[PDB]
Ligand binder design. Structure first.
Ligand code: NAD
Ligand code: NAD
Ligand code: 89V
Ligand code: 89V
Ligand code: MG
Ligand code: MG
Lengths: 342, 342
């Protein structure tokens, strides 16, 4: 049977989510919503969507959908999730989850009280290369992991497609580090303590565009999360996340161009962990775009079976707390206890 | 007209220093000293040295040398440098400089009061690839540096050539990280604050074999110093230090195999930054062995010109403070102020 979705926020990234919902087996978009009638019209016509709302309140009043997909900017996330919980509509919410850890917890609390699933659309861990790093480590190929590096250093002009990124006092950790930190948790488990440093290099923005974060994982592992939008390389890696993992019996090295090198007791293997190229995908976004389909299918599968999602609201709190801790650490110059925040 | 040197400590690394002394123009070794008569004979015969001593006191009593090269283990460093100062003999001392920052400071003050040059033999910054990274950065090719990584991750059995490294409670930071931290200072300047984590992976050693360090440089830059002797790769990089620098106008990437990539406003260049393999050198140590010639020739030039050496006693205090601070940080879990130690 065929699940019916409403997408709220028909913006730049929502277009990818709409393409992917078409591709998803067992779900489709029955209605869309946007405050901007130019976007409502553009996306409605492109994807052949008849039901079109100028405000979310009216969309929820009319009903007719089994889940909601919140692709708006952060300012409206809490309100829209709360509206979803009040109407008992299962909700997907884009990152950043909320404006603070408090708002995030209240959002998780409200959805639990209404007994509806809540998933954060956190798609970086759903990329094919990141899945492959996880599979290799889980298999036992390199023994117990003790050290990692998770790197996203770019000079790509993200500000064209996403103008708001140049305007906030907070930029790179909230926008991108949120993903890289999620990957660190996904691969090496939850974090106990964290230390962070930030810098603004680009003179045309208001926010920090370089962040370096040292993680002490609960399992004993140390990792480095380093992110930059001021790194000028001869070959632009956007939007590849590069990963080094050292274990007691081996190494994983995910390097640029999706090359995956695994050394264990048996010896070295090299694999191509490149993503697929979907019909609607576009270089260099294709890795992210594939991961949109993966996470949207995952949601659809879990909604049908009754299980929890991988980047559930509850789980995402442990990612989001690292974002808020990194800002705190960067300002105070202090190591921050994550356990105490949650 | 050559400067006549005396070498104290005819151990395994001293062989490299003796070879290089032969190559150095304007200096040579006239006497040697070792407490072990087997080593005194081996090195004496190999290099054709007539004057041979069983103790440094008798050596300094007889005199007849212009400088002293101390290649003993750390225990006798303070005593030998003090003997040198009291006999007004310019002194080179192997790393680690001393057992504590306190001893090193007193060693520096004694040489300053005796009006004699004191160089620490700290040779990693004299490696051809590392000099190449310095030169590129100073040229302004990548603008002002804001971020760096300095990385030495090996699975190499250093314990055969140097069995004392397996014995002590302190291992990788004191032995290897001392170099990596010195390089970080050389490239990005002095450090204000420091945070460090350590781990023992290898079951068959007493000390820590993994260390990850975060540096806040006085000039505003942030760097990562990560060192490991428990890293099992498909190609062994021992003993290469891999360096990434990001600047306002470009990047530097010194990668495995002495590959030096520089991206700036005029495109990207790729060059070979590998060492000259000297007649007496031997792979893969030829990197370290060339730097022995470079630093000893440097000493000899500065002893003639009367200028301060690059890794002088006074300079090396600012590297040694970082080793001490890193052990402290790793035990405390706290960030350490470097300026308050000096
Ligand atoms: N990898 C990823 O998953 C990924 C990639 C890019 C962006 N994002 C995230 O997606 C979100 C949206 O990013 P974007 O670049 O598409 O922004 P955008 O500004 O292009 O789109 C937001 C849209 O939502 C509408 N909107 C805002 N508030 C609303 C409300 N209360 N009701 C109805 N409509 C509303 C706006 O009119 C706009 O069209 C952001 O939170 C961003 O962090 C995620
Ligand atoms: N890249 C480098 O610069 C590099 C490389 C290896 C070792 N080292 C350093 O060089 C030093 C020596 O290392 P090694 O591996 O050659 O050690 P080693 O044990 O081979 O050599 C030390 C020698 O000094 C002698 N000795 C000790 N105390 C003495 C005293 N009071 N008087 C006279 N002789 C004495 C010993 O008999 C021994 O032969 C160490 O401090 C080490 O940290 C530096
Ligand atoms: C990769 C980008 C540009 O930071 C995007 O905002 C994202 O969150 O995926
Ligand atoms: C770190 C090494 C290679 O073991 C050696 O002691 C050195 O200082 O070069
Ligand atoms: Mg579908
Ligand atoms: Mg000579």
């Amino acid at each position: 049977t065929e699940l019916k979705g409403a997408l709220i926020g028909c913006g730049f990234f929502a277009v990818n989510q709409m393409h992917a919902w078409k591709d998803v087996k067992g779900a489709g978009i029955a209605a869309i919503c946007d405050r901007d009638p130019k976007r409502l019209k553009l996306v409605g016509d492109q994807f052949g969507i008849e039901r079109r709302y100028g405000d979310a309140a009216a969309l929820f009043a009319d009903g007719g959908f089994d889940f909601v997909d919140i692709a708006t900017t952060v300012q409206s996330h809490r309100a829209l999730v709360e509206m979803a919980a009040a109407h008992k509509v299962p909700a997907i919410c884009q990152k950043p989850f909320a404006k603070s850890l408090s708002d995030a917890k209240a959002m998780v609390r409200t959805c639990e009280n209404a007994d509806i699933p809540l998933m954060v659309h956190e798609n970086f861990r759903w990329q094919t290369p990141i899945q492959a790093v996880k599979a290799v480590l889980e298999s036992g190929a390199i023994g117990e992991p003790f050290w990692g590096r998770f790197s996203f250093r770019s000079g790509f002009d993200v500000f064209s497609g996403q103008p708001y990124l140049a305007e906030g006092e907070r930029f790179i950790i909230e926008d991108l580090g949120i993903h890289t930190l999620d990957i660190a948790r996904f691969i090496l488990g939850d974090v106990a303590t964290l230390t962070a440093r930030t810098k603004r290099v680009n003179p045309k923005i208001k926010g920090e565009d370089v962040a370096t974060i040292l993680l002490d994982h609960q399992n004993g592992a140390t990792s480095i999360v380093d992110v930059s939008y001021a790194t000028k390389l001869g070959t632009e890696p956007f939007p590849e996340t590069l990963i080094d993992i050292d274990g007691t019996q081996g190494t994983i090295r995910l390097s640029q161009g999706y090359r995956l090198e695994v050394t264990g007791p048996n010896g070295m293997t090299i694999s191509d962990a490149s993503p697929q190229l979907l019909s609607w995908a576009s270089r260099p976004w294709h890795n992210i775009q594939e991961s949109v389909l993966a996470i949207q299918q995952h949601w659809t599968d879990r909604l049908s079976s009754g299980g929890e999602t991988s980047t559930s609201g509850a789980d995402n709190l442990k990612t989001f707390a690292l974002v808020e801790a990194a800002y705190e650490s960067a300002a105070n110059g202090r190591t921050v206890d994550i356990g105490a925040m949650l």
